Amino acid sequence: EVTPIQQLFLIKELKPGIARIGVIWDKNAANRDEVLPQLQRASAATGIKVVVAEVASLQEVAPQFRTLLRDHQVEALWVLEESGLLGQAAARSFLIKNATQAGMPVFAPSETWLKEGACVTWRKGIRLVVNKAVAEAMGITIPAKYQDRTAFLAM
Predict the structure, then answer these.
(1) Could you write out the three-class secondary structure of 90-115?
(2) Which residue spans traverse the membrane (predicted)?
């Protein structure tokens, strides 16, 4: 699996200039305690501010997304795993559609997201999976050095 710090360094090259990214994170996930420090470490190493908004129930997904969009003014949505709340298909559809309506990309943990309208996912060196039409609409750029390791995927 591609580590969170690896993902954020890739995000840095895919969205040049991005300064703030929003994570919706399942508070109940078993690896919460270990992932949140790695997100902070990745933020320090890349310089991108990582705003993590935790959700404990389905009813918290929409208000926490609204806080990332409106209050934190993040420039992309980053989803790290989908074992619990983020695997809920209504939450997934909601997050993709509302990020798109804010003109920002979704970096997602699996290809199912890309089929539903997310932008970029990753596999393993590292290979990128990109929904090209959506990535294009959300302002993603694929640098020259990663073109040979990038697969496009149909919606």
Answers:
(1) HHHHHHHHHHHHCCCCEECCCHHHHH
(2) none
